[PDB]
Design a protein around this ligand. Structure first.
Ligand SMILES: O=C(Cc1cccc(Cl)c1)Nc1cncc2cccnc12
Ligand SMILES: O=C(Cc1cccc(Cl)c1)Nc1cncc2cccnc12
Lengths: 304, 304
């Protein structure tokens, strides 16, 4: 019993973190096999970040300018290339601690763990969701660039995010491990619109099922709704429209609790229209959307 | 910017987890140097848990009855002893992955990370507080016994908690690494009073300072209070009385923000008396007490 914002164990990722320095900028890199991945803005000075021409800036750099240090040991750089917004530094030594891994592009609404790092050293781990507007509400300070987001399935780490930037609004933007930004962001010191965010409906429903499993049931009502009626309410409250694909992935939670997905939608509709009335659900006074249906089943079944 | 319920990176602890089996019960153990620590109830069957005489139950067991497996490799047990509610299994091999460590008894109100494990395998990591009533509001399923709580200072892991039991109320109880229960609990299948819990005032104030640092300032008011006046309000709302020792540990956060501790107490007093009025602070609609002043400074300064 109990329900927490649980992160994946970070050990497999801690073994991949290194410090990358170029000129006077230092950030984090991810060492997998014989390649170190890091944000390409490691080649910029603060003056360059205004409107950087990364191709020209990288031309002035050579392999010996990229200082890569894995804990205490120095790595020898034998190649460098820019792929989208990431630099790939080929090193002469394969990381002996490379776990089984994949590079994945996650969908908005999906969750992942972040291992926040500074100077190649891990500082903390937390769980978060990729917002529908492709930002993340992380906890990151200067020097955290190059920290990564990931998920783990048994022995395989699927890397989905590399941290690059904090918007003027205090939210975070980054790329997949091929250097493609999630969302419309560019790696420049310019104000950039994140765009309208929405609440991840399928995740709120999954968390309501997690509440029922853990004993919080006060919000269950005698009502039902339809996808159409629920979606009129979701529109009004800035929630993502619920589809049959979302109902389908909620199937296991519906079977576990015996509560039909549309009946749980009616509970969600009532909570959106009336609020919580000073009550809480799983220690929260708001509707939580950072747990996917897969996260709820994993946490409520103990997958290792 | 951003503020998350951040856990310590769990890699150093993942390297210590093993599976311990005795008879038909399997739980987790912590392998440090040549000793494996685990809850002593690993020697019980379900029938024994009613009123176990652990001394008699352990007398029927020999070294060869304790099966300890570290991932895939089997450990040879050359000694066993019971210390309070933990068993210490001496093994013939020192754990090569033993980090620098200490065994500490944490105070109520302090925080720590839990590495939830099943069958010696890590499943997730989360941050929590030891409640004033010596329970923890964890996320644990059957088989999670032996999972540990810890803090990390640079390269040293201070182990503070070993999980033992879930109370009928769904909250969790466990011991320090010398096997002493936190709180009045006994390792028996009997209903046990946890006792009145309270909100950790110093931690709510620390989190309010974290909110100001991260830009959430709507709750700041034109008022001040005294320790005596604030404590009348704290009494009414089931908050721990604030002392000068708590004001002293809030000093760094007061210096960072320029907000006197008693002025922040007046903000807390107003939030307790009026509620949040449908507003949020750091993504929460309630007053959070799972961040200590040290946690706030660590997260807002990036200690690795
Ligand atoms: O945003 C930047 C630097 C930057 C500037 C423009 C474009 C790009 Cl790609 C990167 N770095 C940081 C990341 N996360 C959090 C922060 C907190 C404080 C200060 N810097 C932070
Ligand atoms: O509480 C027990 C077993 C037990 C019974 C009596 C005394 C003692 Cl020391 C231990 N184990 C579990 C721990 N945490 C969470 C659980 C969730 C479901 C089922 N068991 C759980």
């Amino acid at each position: 019993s109990g329900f927490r914002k649980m992160a994946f164990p970070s050990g497999k990722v801690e073994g991949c973190m290194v410090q990358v320095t170029c000129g006077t900028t230092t950030l984090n890199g991810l060492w997998l096999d014989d390649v170190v991945y890091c944000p390409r803005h490691v080649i910029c000075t603060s003056e360059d970040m205004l409107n950087p021409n990364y191709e020209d800036l990288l031309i002035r750099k050579s392999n010996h300018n990229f200082l890569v240090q894995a804990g205490n040991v120095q790595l020898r750089v034998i190649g460098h290339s820019m792929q989208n917004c990431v630099l790939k530094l080929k090193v002469d030594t394969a990381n002996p601690k490379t776990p089984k891994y994949k590079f994945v592009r996650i969908q908005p609404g999906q969750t992942f763990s972040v291992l926040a790092c500074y100077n190649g050293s891990p500082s903390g781990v937390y769980q978060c969701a990729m917002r529908p507007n492709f930002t993340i509400k992380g906890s990151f300070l200067n020097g955290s660039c190059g920290s990564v987001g990931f998920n783990i399935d048994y022995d395989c780490v699927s890397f989905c995010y590399m941290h690059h930037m904090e918007l003027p609004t205090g939210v975070h933007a980054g790329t997949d491990l091929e250097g493609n930004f999630y969302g419309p962001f560019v790696d420049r010191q310019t104000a950039q619109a994140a765009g309208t965010d929405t609440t991840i409906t399928v995740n709120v429903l999954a968390w309501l099922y997690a509440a029922v499993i853990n004993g919080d049931r006060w919000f269950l009502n005698r009502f039902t709704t339809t996808l159409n009626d629920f979606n009129l309410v979701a529109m009004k409250y800035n929630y993502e429209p619920l589809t049959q694909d979302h109902v389908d992935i909620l199937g296991p939670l519906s079977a576990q609790t015996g509560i039909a997905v549309l009946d749980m939608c009616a509970s969600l509709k009532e909570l959106l229209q009336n609020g919580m009335n000073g009550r809480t659900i799983l220690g929260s006074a708001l509707l939580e959307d950072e747990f996917t249906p897969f996260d709820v089943v994993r946490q409520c079944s103990g997958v290792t």
